[PDB]
Design an enzyme around this catalytic site. Sequence first.
Site, PDB file in Angstrom:
ATOM      1  N   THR A 245     -12.118  16.438   2.976  1.00  0.00           N
ATOM      2  CA  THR A 245     -11.964  16.168   1.550  1.00  0.00           C
ATOM      3  C   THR A 245     -10.686  16.801   1.013  1.00  0.00           C
ATOM      4  O   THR A 245      -9.915  16.160   0.286  1.00  0.00           O
ATOM      5  CB  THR A 245     -13.167  16.689   0.768  1.00  0.00           C
ATOM      6  OG1 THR A 245     -14.356  16.545   1.556  1.00  0.00           O
ATOM      7  CG2 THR A 245     -13.316  15.912  -0.532  1.00  0.00           C
ATOM      8  N   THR A 246     -10.440  18.064   1.382  1.00  0.00           N
ATOM      9  CA  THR A 246      -9.291  18.789   0.854  1.00  0.00           C
ATOM     10  C   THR A 246      -7.977  18.141   1.277  1.00  0.00           C
ATOM     11  O   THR A 246      -6.974  18.253   0.564  1.00  0.00           O
ATOM     12  CB  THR A 246      -9.353  20.253   1.318  1.00  0.00           C
ATOM     13  OG1 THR A 246     -10.650  20.788   1.031  1.00  0.00           O
ATOM     14  CG2 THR A 246      -8.300  21.115   0.623  1.00  0.00           C
TER      15      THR A 246
ATOM     16  N   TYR B  80     -21.322   7.231  -0.786  1.00  0.00           N
ATOM     17  CA  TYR B  80     -21.411   5.988  -1.562  1.00  0.00           C
ATOM     18  C   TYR B  80     -22.590   5.094  -1.165  1.00  0.00           C
ATOM     19  O   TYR B  80     -23.334   4.648  -2.049  1.00  0.00           O
ATOM     20  CB  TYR B  80     -20.098   5.202  -1.480  1.00  0.00           C
ATOM     21  CG  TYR B  80     -20.052   3.942  -2.322  1.00  0.00           C
ATOM     22  CD1 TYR B  80     -20.424   3.957  -3.666  1.00  0.00           C
ATOM     23  CD2 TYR B  80     -19.623   2.738  -1.776  1.00  0.00           C
ATOM     24  CE1 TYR B  80     -20.377   2.797  -4.435  1.00  0.00           C
ATOM     25  CE2 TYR B  80     -19.570   1.578  -2.537  1.00  0.00           C
ATOM     26  CZ  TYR B  80     -19.952   1.612  -3.861  1.00  0.00           C
ATOM     27  OH  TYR B  80     -19.897   0.455  -4.616  1.00  0.00           O
TER      28      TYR B  80
ATOM     29  N   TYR C 277     -21.583  17.982   8.040  1.00  0.00           N
ATOM     30  CA  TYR C 277     -20.951  18.410   6.798  1.00  0.00           C
ATOM     31  C   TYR C 277     -21.737  17.788   5.650  1.00  0.00           C
ATOM     32  O   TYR C 277     -21.716  16.568   5.459  1.00  0.00           O
ATOM     33  CB  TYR C 277     -19.474  18.005   6.793  1.00  0.00           C
ATOM     34  CG  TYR C 277     -18.717  18.221   5.502  1.00  0.00           C
ATOM     35  CD1 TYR C 277     -19.159  19.128   4.539  1.00  0.00           C
ATOM     36  CD2 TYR C 277     -17.533  17.534   5.263  1.00  0.00           C
ATOM     37  CE1 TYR C 277     -18.463  19.302   3.353  1.00  0.00           C
ATOM     38  CE2 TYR C 277     -16.824  17.708   4.088  1.00  0.00           C
ATOM     39  CZ  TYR C 277     -17.281  18.595   3.150  1.00  0.00           C
ATOM     40  OH  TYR C 277     -16.563  18.762   1.996  1.00  0.00           O
TER      41      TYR C 277
ATOM     42  N   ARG D 136     -20.473  15.174  -3.761  1.00  0.00           N
ATOM     43  CA  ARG D 136     -19.449  14.156  -3.543  1.00  0.00           C
ATOM     44  C   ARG D 136     -19.972  12.919  -2.830  1.00  0.00           C
ATOM     45  O   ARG D 136     -19.472  11.817  -3.091  1.00  0.00           O
ATOM     46  CB  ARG D 136     -18.261  14.729  -2.752  1.00  0.00           C
ATOM     47  CG  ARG D 136     -17.450  15.776  -3.522  1.00  0.00           C
ATOM     48  CD  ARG D 136     -16.774  15.179  -4.759  1.00  0.00           C
ATOM     49  NE  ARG D 136     -15.804  16.079  -5.372  1.00  0.00           N
ATOM     50  CZ  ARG D 136     -14.584  16.324  -4.900  1.00  0.00           C
ATOM     51  NH1 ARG D 136     -14.133  15.679  -3.829  1.00  0.00           N
ATOM     52  NH2 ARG D 136     -13.794  17.187  -5.532  1.00  0.00           N
TER      53      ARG D 136
ATOM     54  N   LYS E 172     -21.695  22.425   7.968  1.00  0.00           N
ATOM     55  CA  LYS E 172     -20.885  22.999   6.924  1.00  0.00           C
ATOM     56  C   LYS E 172     -21.640  22.637   5.675  1.00  0.00           C
ATOM     57  O   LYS E 172     -21.807  21.477   5.376  1.00  0.00           O
ATOM     58  CB  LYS E 172     -19.444  22.511   6.864  1.00  0.00           C
ATOM     59  CG  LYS E 172     -18.703  22.670   5.554  1.00  0.00           C
ATOM     60  CD  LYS E 172     -17.286  22.115   5.531  1.00  0.00           C
ATOM     61  CE  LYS E 172     -16.565  22.232   4.193  1.00  0.00           C
ATOM     62  NZ  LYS E 172     -15.404  21.368   4.163  1.00  0.00           N
TER      63      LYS E 172
ATOM     64  N   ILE F  50     -15.401  27.140   6.266  1.00  0.00           N
ATOM     65  CA  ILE F  50     -14.349  26.136   6.193  1.00  0.00           C
ATOM     66  C   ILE F  50     -13.897  26.145   4.742  1.00  0.00           C
ATOM     67  O   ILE F  50     -14.634  25.689   3.855  1.00  0.00           O
ATOM     68  CB  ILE F  50     -14.836  24.751   6.644  1.00  0.00           C
ATOM     69  CG1 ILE F  50     -15.067  24.768   8.166  1.00  0.00           C
ATOM     70  CG2 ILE F  50     -13.831  23.651   6.231  1.00  0.00           C
ATOM     71  CD1 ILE F  50     -15.786  23.544   8.709  1.00  0.00           C
TER      72      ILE F  50
END
Lengths: 296, 296
Positions: free
Chosen positions: A45-46, A109, A135, A140, A164, A205
């Site tokens: 994501t980052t 989604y 993860y 999100r 994570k 992370i």
Amino acid sequence: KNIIIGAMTALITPFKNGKVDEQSYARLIKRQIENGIDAVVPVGTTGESATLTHEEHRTCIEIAVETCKGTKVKVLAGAGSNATHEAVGLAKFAKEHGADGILSVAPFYNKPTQQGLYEHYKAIAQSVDIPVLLYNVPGRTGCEISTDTIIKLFRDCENIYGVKEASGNIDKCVDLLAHEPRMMLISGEDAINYPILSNGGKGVISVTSNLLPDMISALTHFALDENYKEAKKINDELYNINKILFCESNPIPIKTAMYLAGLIESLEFRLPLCSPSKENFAKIEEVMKKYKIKGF
Amino acid sequence: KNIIIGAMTALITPFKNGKVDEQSYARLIKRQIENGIDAVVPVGTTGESATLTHEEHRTCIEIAVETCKGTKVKVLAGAGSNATHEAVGLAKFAKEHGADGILSVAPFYNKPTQQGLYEHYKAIAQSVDIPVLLYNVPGRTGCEISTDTIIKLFRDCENIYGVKEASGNIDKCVDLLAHEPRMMLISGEDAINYPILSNGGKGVISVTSNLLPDMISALTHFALDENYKEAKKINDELYNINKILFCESNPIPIKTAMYLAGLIESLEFRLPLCSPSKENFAKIEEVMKKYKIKGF
Ligand SMILES: N[C@@H](CCCC[NH3+])C(=O)O
Ligand SMILES: N[C@@H](CCCC[NH3+])C(=O)O
């Protein structure tokens, strides 16, 4: 089980004139290496996974692998997708191109059921022979990997070794490690790095480590040695910057901070991501003044 | 403003042996046309956009355009993306291949700010000259298009003409139409079709209409003609099926229903989507039997 643990960085992806700044990406990774980071996570994501092409995604994984060559730092390649056939492709690429393992975000989604998440991750895990870290980030993705599903995947798939967690749910972190103490729980939430580690988590992370890799590194290794006093003192000192880095959606604040610190050349995002408000720009700049930011 | 309103269907995408069944897709569309539907929406959430390739996505839009050719039924093409460059590409394809307009879901997973949502949609709207309908579904995307952002986009961009709301928030629907009564508010939540229409909404984009197109079309046309007593009567009768079609994540239940009705050949999804539980399967089947399902 083979694992990838310790202090790890969710790498930002720098842009120049709309393209991936490839020498800036390698220089940033080198800086992480030299400040005690144990592994790097390219394109999560980052790293603006959403707006990179599949080609650029693969290029960033390659730069990460090439840069960590000859060091102890591992590459936990971002390879998640809401399409199982897409996630398997990225996982197979990461294995064939020298990644030490893969991070795989829960499908966003389209909200699969728990049965679907199980089949999604089993297909990914069976496609390669390198470690796979789940993860979970429901704010999100719109979905949650339940504790039962995580534990089932860990016990049923040899290379799935942990998760994570970015869910703000320390109860779930107790649940996970009380029923399956062999898994590697990784903090995906910088503000609560120490509590997760103090309950038996084995790494982070981090977003903040992009800016302060040395501090996040020290925190994690203090905690792993059960030097809880030192680990907590750093977690407490970092709280203000840990929270201000999410004043707007990650990675807008961290990229703003990296630019203000002179670590990247131009702000630049790919739409729909954009530069922060003037207020938040000024807030990020204020909080930064309270920390020592290593250069190159 | 040029607009696309009335009763519309979020089309399921049937698979056979893992590929798109193009003859079944065209046949289902024709079934919709024959039951009073005003427009069809290829490749939305319900059409499993996430797991279609960009090319299958484009193929489905083309089939919708051919099948509606020569009829009064319009094609509002699913063209959303969480990457603005991807959404612009899909918008231009839909325009170049004869769609009457596009639906564009708010970016999922990367959570843009309100400013980013504005620039995202301004880029899409400026890329084509056909109507653009925004699509808000925060439970799936992780972000919300605020009422202010929706209204600013409606007033600032000529072709942006309204919003499909799937947020379970009738307060927001009052907010939208009280401050900007010129926009086309479209229901994206079948159970509350009538309340949205009775407040001045001008259409629905429906999941239930896949199975009962005649009932959803009648409901909408009753309401548009200000027969609220009959529109509400159908909305009330449909409540049970409207809820059971989300016992699991859409479109798992609606495809299960279409298969049980003999309207598609096989109950096939693409991972991470999968068949419902045995319990849910039986629940969908039991509720279906209280309704009259139109054939071919
Ligand atoms: N917009 C796509 C891009 C995937 C390709 C690069 N990770 C997504 O978020 O799934
Ligand atoms: N899985 C990706 C790619 C979809 C491309 C076709 N619609 C996404 O949801 O954005």
